[PDB]
């Protein structure tokens, strides 16, 4: 979950996978700009896998 | 995580909460490990070398006790009778002192005040706690039976006051991977920092928690009917037990 969008596209409090997030963090920090910073999640596997 | 200090027979007292002690052998490797509550009388000191089936450490189950770390005399601050304790006297002992009530059972006149345990030397000024500046006090929390009177002289180790106090199998498993919330879940230290509390009002208590260098507000709200293992004078850890479960 995001807490700052920082530079990027994300939202105040949108939940989005975490790998696309770093790779989006990887992408930002090779243009001399700011990241998102966030929040893990932890989720039970019924709700994970749905 | 040990904060000790030692009595007058010698023994020592802990004041910590997450004292921890083991066994190492010559050798260098830990072959057990045990916890220690807060207020345990240790009967060997760090390090000392011990042999088998020996009594290292004991306690009182049935009671938290709040400790002095200083020696000294105490005074009442904020000891008004009728508004703040009782006075019990006992029909069979004989041997009984003041006992402090809580907000739940003293009248309006004592919401606004809130007792306390100072300690001062026999100059009667503030005996200041070693290694910090601010005044040795302590505040009496409710159903807390106050033993010595007004004029008797205290030391470390003393009983400054008395506080008297799953599942298994498949389902548990599947609990565990569900990431269910317990019926019961403990309470934890949100942030570090020196604790307080607030205005007891309706049915909850309020708990206030500042950094000592840092972003100084933060407050949590908390069912009053659970019971509390901190102190109002103690500065917690990020993450530590607030309330057991």
Known sequence: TIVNAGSSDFLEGEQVEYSRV????????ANGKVGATYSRDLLGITKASL | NVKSVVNSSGKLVITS???????????????????????????????????????VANWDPHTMPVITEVSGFVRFTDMIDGQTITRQTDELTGLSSLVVLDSAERT?????????????????????????????????????????EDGVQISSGDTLARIP??????????????????????????????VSFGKETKGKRRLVITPVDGSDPYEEMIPKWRQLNVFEGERVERGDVISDG
Not at chain 2, 172 to 190: Q, Y
């Open chain 2, 17 to 55: 909460r997450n004292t921890e002690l083991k066994l190492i052998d010559e050798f260098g490797r830990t072959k057990e490990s045990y916890k220690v509550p807060y207020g345990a009388v240790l009967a060997k000191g760090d390090g000392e070398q011990v042999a088998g089936g020996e009594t």
């Open chain 1, 22 to 29: 770093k790779i989006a963090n990887r992408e930002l920090e």
């Open chain 2, 108 to 148: 309006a006149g004592g919401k606004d005040l809130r007792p306390a345990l100072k300690i001062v030397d026999a100059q009667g000024n503030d005996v200041l706690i070693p290694g910090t500046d601010m005044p040795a006090q302590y505040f009496l929390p409710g159903k807390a039976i106050v033993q010595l």
């Open chain 2, 165 to 194: 106090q799953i599942t298994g199998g498949l389902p548990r498993v599947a609990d565990l991977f569900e990431a269910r919330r317990p019926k019961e879940p403990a309470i934890l230290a949100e942030i570090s920092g020196i």
